[PDB]
Amino acid sequence: AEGPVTATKPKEAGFTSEGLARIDAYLKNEIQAKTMPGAVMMIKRNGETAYFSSFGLRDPDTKEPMTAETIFRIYSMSKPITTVAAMMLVEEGKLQLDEPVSKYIPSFANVKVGVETKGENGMALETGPVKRAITIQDLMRHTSGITYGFVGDGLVKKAYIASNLFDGDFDNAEFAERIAKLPLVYQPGTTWDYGHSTDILGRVVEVVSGKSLYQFEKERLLDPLGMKDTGFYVTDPAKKSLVAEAMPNDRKIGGSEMFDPRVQKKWEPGGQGMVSTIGDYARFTQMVLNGGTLDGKRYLSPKTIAYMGSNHIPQASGIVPGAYYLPGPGVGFGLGFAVRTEAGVTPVEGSVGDLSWGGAGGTVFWIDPKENLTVVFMAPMVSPRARVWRTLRNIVYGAFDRLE
Structure with a gap:
């Protein structure tokens, strides 16, 4: 009281x-x-x-x-x-919602999408190309395929956890690279899924602003x-x-x-x-x-x-x-x-x-x-x-x- x-x-x-x-x-x-x-x-x-x-x-x-x-x-x-913060850059014409994230962070150009499928010993991941590049808007509304390892469950999420994304003393640039190495949980621009998209957006803001x-x-x-x-x-x-x-x-x-x-x-x-x-x-x-x-x-x-x-x-x-x-x-x-x-x-x-x-x-x-x-x-x-x-x-x- x-x-x-x-x-x-x-x-x-x-x-x-x-x-x-x-x-x-x-x-x-x-x-x-x-x-x-x-x-x-x-x-x-x-x-x-x-x-x-x-x-x-x-x-x-x-x-x-x-x-x-x-x-x-x-x-x-x-x-x-x-x-x-990102929208302020948008109002100044320094960032666009339909632009691919890969334009600011190249490593996201070749990310793959993981799909769960049955293998010889249980469920496993099959990976394929994205049908569309992840956009700035995708990051802002969480429809990028980037997820959270500890929210819910799934093979891609388990991979997030196994990658030990939070070890050491790293900056936003390094974190973005760590995320880019992981498979996406859904095809970009198709599904709402909570995740590290905003951390990536933060890096985009740094790349644009310097x-x-x-x-x-x-x-x-x-x-x-x-x-x-x-x-x-x-x-x-x-x-x-x-x-x-x-x-x-x-x-x-x-x-x-x-x-x-x-x-x-x-x-x-x-x-x-x-x-x-x-x-x-x-x-x-x-x-x-x-x-x-x-x-x-x-x-x-x-x-x-x-x-x-x-x-x-x-x-x-x-x-x-x-x-x-x-x-x-x-x-x-x-x-x-x-x-x-x-x-x-x-x-x-x-x-x-x-x-x-x-x-x-x-x-x-x-x-x-x-x-x-x-x-x-x-x-x-x-x-x-x-x-x-x-x-x-x-x-x-x-x-x-x-x-x-």
């Missing part, structure tokens, strides 16, 4: 105080159940802060309190930021937006104790302990390596809700934002869901965002057109243009994250007193 971080205007935000109180009760109960050591959450609607509270601890071992300034490993929430992913983002987005505690590593000695840590029995991601952001390394993966704070990320999402601008500064045009927020894998795309379609029924996917397409069907409340994504470390956010709403939630945890995120959606929408 703890309470509000700042003053709030729930009624003007279109919520009831009784409804929002349900969030307090839920979070405190989950903390008591040891689902997480603590949590911080912010809800903004109609340009007003409807809710902003923190509860519990940011670290169960040190017993340090959960605060608004607490730094979280945001993992996959790094993707929308990486994608926005800068490291972090420096490019720092200059074009992080500094101007005021996201002073957002990056890939916590190098400021005064900020190292602010890193949130999950319960002892829930610190494993992909079969390994969470990386230590307090120790700088060469890798700056655009799909999973960032650290940030709720305040920093809220500015990023507000910028997106605003159509690409914040505090008088424009980062992307409103057309570009609308384009990123559109479904890029509907029927007209011919794209089909892969074996592990994470967004689930009633939800599509755009350029770095899951996009709700059905009012019902999806088993959680929300609005057609709302944008969202989460991180394996417990963080999640969503932007609802129809309801002029943005929500950011951060709590260090892994196994129960999806359950908590879905429940929070229900509670937030369940606290509405009116529709916009």
Whole structure:
């Protein structure tokens, strides 16, 4: 427990105080159940802060309190930021969505597609050529054939694991080469499958800009937006104790302990390596809700934002869901965002057109243009994250007193 971080205007935000109180009760109960050591959450609607509270601890071992300034490993929430960075280059005519990835990273020109088939001793992989080159758009919407070794199962995924992709101290250029040596799980441009595509996109950004992913983002987005505690590593000695840590029995991601952001390394993966704070990320999402601008500064045009927020894998795309379609029924996917397409069907409340994504470390956010709403939630945890995120959606929408 703890309470509000700042003053709030729930009624003007279109919520009831009784409804929002349900969030307090839920979070405190989950903390008591040891689902997480603590949590911080912010809800903004109609340009007003409807809710902003923190509860519990940011670290169960040190017993340090959960605060608004607490730094979280945001993992996959790094993707929308990486994608926005790439789209800035697109707006300047320095990158195109239909261009082949191989144009920037040659090793991807000759990747092969693995297909499971019966052999003398069980299932084995047959490999063949791609029918189409992987495009920049494919990377942005996860229809490139590039996957994640630890998500679901399969022979290609087992090959990812066997290749020990995360050994040593390597940079984005080297990681891209490691990925390029592996077979794809699906033909490029045909199937949605979550994977390392965004890490590859990050390298594309470096090739085009001539800068490291972090420096490019720092200059074009992080500094101007005021996201002073957002990056890939916590190098400021005064900020190292602010890193949130999950319960002892829930610190494993992909079969390994969470990386230590307090120790700088060469890798700056655009799909999973960032650290940030709720305040920093809220500015990023507000910028997106605003159509690409914040505090008088424009980062992307409103057309570009609308384009990123559109479904890029509907029927007209011919794209089909892969074996592990994470967004689930009633939800599509755009350029770095899951996009709700059905009012019902999806088993959680929300609005057609709302944008969202989460991180394996417990963080999640969503932007609802129809309801002029943005929500950011951060709590260090892994196994129960999806359950908590879905429940929070229900509670937030369940606290509405009116529709916009």
